[PDB]
Amino acid sequence: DPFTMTPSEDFVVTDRGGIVENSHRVHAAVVDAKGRLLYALGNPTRMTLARSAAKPAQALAILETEGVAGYGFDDADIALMCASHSSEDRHIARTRAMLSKIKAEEADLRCGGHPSLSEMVNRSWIKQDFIPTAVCSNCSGHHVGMLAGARAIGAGTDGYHLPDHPMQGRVKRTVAELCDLDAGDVEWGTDGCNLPTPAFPLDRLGRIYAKLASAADGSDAGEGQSTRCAALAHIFRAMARHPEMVAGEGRYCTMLMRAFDGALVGKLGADASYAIGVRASDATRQLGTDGALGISVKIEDGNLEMLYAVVTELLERLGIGSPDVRSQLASFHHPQRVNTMGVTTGGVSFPFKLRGDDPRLAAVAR
Amino acid sequence: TPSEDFVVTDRGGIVENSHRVHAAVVDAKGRLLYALGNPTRMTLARSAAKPAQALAILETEGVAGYGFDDADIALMCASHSSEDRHIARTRAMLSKIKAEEADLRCGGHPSLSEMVNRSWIKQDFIPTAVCSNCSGHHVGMLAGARAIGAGTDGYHLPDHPMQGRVKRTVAELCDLDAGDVEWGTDGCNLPTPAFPLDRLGRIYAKLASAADGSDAGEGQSTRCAALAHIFRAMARHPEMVAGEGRYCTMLMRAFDGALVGKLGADASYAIGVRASDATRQLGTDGALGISVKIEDGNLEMLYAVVTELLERLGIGSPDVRSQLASFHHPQRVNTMGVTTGGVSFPFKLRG
Ligand SMILES: NC(=O)C[C@H](N)C(=O)O
Ligand SMILES: NC(=O)C[C@H](N)C(=O)O
Ligand SMILES: [Cl-]
Ligand SMILES: [Cl-]
């Protein structure tokens, strides 16, 4: 019965010959520039570890640290501070360039190597028996930013990654401020790169990216801006102009931002979160808001292939982009289900229902 | 009405991911003894149905003349890691039936073992049909085709007599009518069945029950005798069923003949447990079957839940199950060696 559909039924499902294989619960929030909730799937206020979808907010703490401007970080450097890069050689090279700009060494990094986020890079590493190091971390440009901030204020580079360090005090404050949350409403764990990483309600992730895109609109319009809005507009512009620094070739974030060519930024969080800040457009206005928009997504079970499918389907349902823009993401939207002899064995479907109904139909966030 | 049963991973006490678990524990006739989630969930068994499909091969007239041995039969029940020793046995079995690799209708794929696949990548190796994790099963299907004079071209299509036999045999083992088993196409290009999750447990209860009756000298039909043979072959050659470091191999080695277990792609699992003090404490006087499906398809979580289930059920000693400790509580350690989180099992088995 379609007249009693509920948030708890918001799934992305794969099939084999029409028989259900796997299904994945979806949570999504679409918010305006003040964080007002416009559309939802699942539980839009789910307490969620943002993971690297929080890196642009952490990068604002770096950019607002007195003295950092003196180092001459350029837009590509700042995109790398916002990144989960593929450890391509240009990412490793830019990390070494940034270390030189602040006169630090790779031994000053407290993040660690891992297998590349790109299969193609990993394949090359395997052939050469290469063991990744700190400078290869997908979060290396962010760790260099944190080192830069520590040096700028005279705090010292030892322990920049620890919560008692002044840089982490600044990060924690800035994240809660961008979310419009009290400190006790943001929880903190330890990330794969060994930095504190925040958790907060999923819609406030959307809220951070609606503020990024709104700042981009204020800047493009020539409006006087606070130092913070100017810094948010700089982050937006850096990500959108250097999206390959944010991820890498073949990566969803890079292909999404190239496709939209300035109209939005997007960023992955590990274990299948996603965030998008959408500049004001005919599409946002048709959706019922006069400003910018933020979108945030979490796949409950952590599946990345399903995340990219769902995010792409969500952009289509919200009317964001053109069929031709979004067709650049078609391999993510409808993942190949082809067996070892080249026969198509099934596919992906999206039995979820965006909600903004009989008044008696309860939408219990689940 | 199924309850909400999850395995949950956390980072610092904060929920990261959660995975819905379905499980059925059944006795030798298939009566439901304990459950998680929806124990009758319609579920693609994938390679957890390989032993049942292998019974069709073993029951085919003339197949006994090829001289397949127990390790060979274990390969027919396998999702092996494409180790060089699995490749060699696939070629050996092709020689017993006078076939060649071109006769195979499965395709190569990245190895189920990460270590094997990195070895292949380092050497620019392109896997072929003989490397398929289901190669031994395909060689069995070729064997049955040749045995009845069916012709080896198209042994994998539903209208081939071998597939007619497989289709009929799966439903019989499940105790289902033909129309209660649904069929899709597998990664290896064979038909593959879907049926209620509890019937998967039932198949494996029948495997273990046949082993019990064989070990006791009982009046066994030809079918029970072959089910017993399948159980013995898997328990005696668990490295053919999977490979080094693989959960099924380590589970079966740990238990040393008391059970068999088998993985299904997209995170199904089946165990047939021979009658024991453990099963008697669980309230049944014969063998027992266990089947499990992680709704979202996560394998790490599957292995964790299966081992937690063995512990809840008291199957094995604590010493035996501690051999699976790395699967039971997967590592949650970051790139700098710091423990960042863990796995929890906030569910209760319902009886
Ligand atoms: N892209 C990511 O979310 C990576 C994550 N920040 C980590 O270090 O584990
Ligand atoms: N292990 C498996 O279930 C493999 C599966 N039978 C396939 O061919 O895709
Ligand atoms: Cl497939
Ligand atoms: Cl981690």
CB B47 within 8 A of CB B33: no
> Residue B66 half-sphere exposure, CB side, CA atoms within 13 Å?
29
Tell me the count of A-B CB pairs closer than 8 A: 124
CB A260 within 8 A of CB A321: yes
Q: Do A23 and B298 touch (CB under 8 A)?
A: no
Instruction: Calculate the alpha carbon distances from A133 to A249, A352, B333 in Å.
Output: 21, 42, 16
Written as six digits, the tokens of A275 are 């965030």
CB B258 within 8 A of CB B316: yes
Helix (H) or strand (E) holding A127: helix A119-127
For A260, residues 6+ apart whose C-beta sits below 8 A from its C-beta are A321, A325
State phi, psi for A266 to the nearest 5 degrees: -140, 155
For B56, residues 6+ apart whose C-beta sits below 8 A from its C-beta are B144, B162, B165, B166, B168, B169
Sign of CA dihedral A44, A46, A52, A58: positive
Helix (H) or strand (E) holding B15: strand B14-27
For B182, residues 6+ apart whose C-beta sits below 8 A from its C-beta are A17, A19, B42, B193, B194, B195
Closest Cβ opposite residue B296 in set A23, A49, A271: A23
Closest Cβ opposite residue A22 in set B11, B182, B295: B295
DSSP states along B201-258: HHHHHHHHHHHHHHHTT----HHHHHHHHHHHHHHH-HHHHS-TT-HHHHHHHHHTTS
Chain A contact for B333, CB < 8 A? no
> What resolution does the deposited structure have, in angstroms?
1.7
Q: How far apart are CA B155 and CA A331, in angstroms?
A: 33
State phi, psi for A339 to the nearest 5 degrees: -80, -170
Hey, how many other C-beta atoms are within 10 angstroms of the C-beta on A100?
11
Q: Which atom of ligand 1 is nearest to the CA of A55?
A: 6
Q: Name the amino acid, one letter, at A118.
A: S
Helix (H) or strand (E) holding B47: none
Burial of residue A153, with CB atoms counted within 10 A of its CB: 0-12 exposed, 13-18 middle, 19 or more buried:
middle
Chain B contact for A342, CB < 8 A? yes
Written as six digits, the tokens of B221 are 């039909």
Taking alpha carbons only, the member of A173, A139, A125 closest to residue A270 is A139
From chain A, pick out residues whose CB is under 8 angstroms from the CB of B108. Answer: 340
Q: Which atom of ligand 1 is nearest to the CA of A273?
A: 3
State phi, psi for A31 to the nearest 5 degrees: -130, 160
Sign of CA dihedral A172, A175, A178, A184: negative
- B81 CB under 6 A from ligand 2? no
Q: Do A189 and B11 touch (CB under 8 A)?
A: yes
Q: How far apart are CA A77 and CA A344, in angstroms?
A: 43
Written as six digits, the tokens of A346 are 């099934």
From chain A, pick out residues whose CB is under 8 angstroms from the CB of B107. Answer: 339-342
CB B90 within 8 A of CB B139: yes
- Give the three-state DSSP class for A317: helix
Q: How far apart are CA A229 and CA A238, in angstroms?
A: 14
- Give the three-state DSSP class for A22: strand
Q: How far apart are CA B105 and CA A345, in angstroms?
A: 15
Q: Do B12 and A302 touch (CB under 8 A)?
A: no
Instruction: Calculate the alpha carbon distances from B64 to A296, B20, B61, B156, B349 in Å.
Output: 60, 43, 8, 21, 43
- B246 CB under 6 A from ligand 2? no
Q: Which 217-276 residues of chain A touch chain B by CB within 8 A?
A: 271-272
- Which residues are B26's β-sheet partners? B32, B289
CA-based R_g, chain A, Å:
20
Q: How far apart are CA B92 and CA B98, in angstroms?
A: 10
- B270 CB under 6 A from ligand 2? no
- A193 CB under 6 A from ligand 1? yes
From chain B, pick out residues whose CB is under 8 angstroms from the CB of A24. Answer: 296
Taking alpha carbons only, the member of A183, A121, A146 closest to residue A58 is A146
Where do the structural domains in chain A lie, given as residue ranges? Answer: 47-333
- A269 CB under 6 A from ligand 1? yes
Q: Name the amino acid, one letter, at A269.
A: G
> Which residue shows structure tokens 């696939």?
B90
- Give the three-state DSSP class for A226: coil
- Give the three-state DSSP class for A192: coil
- Which residues are A47's β-sheet partners? A201
CB A161 within 8 A of CB A143: yes
Determined by: X-ray
Closest Cβ opposite residue A343 in set B42, B183, B189: B189
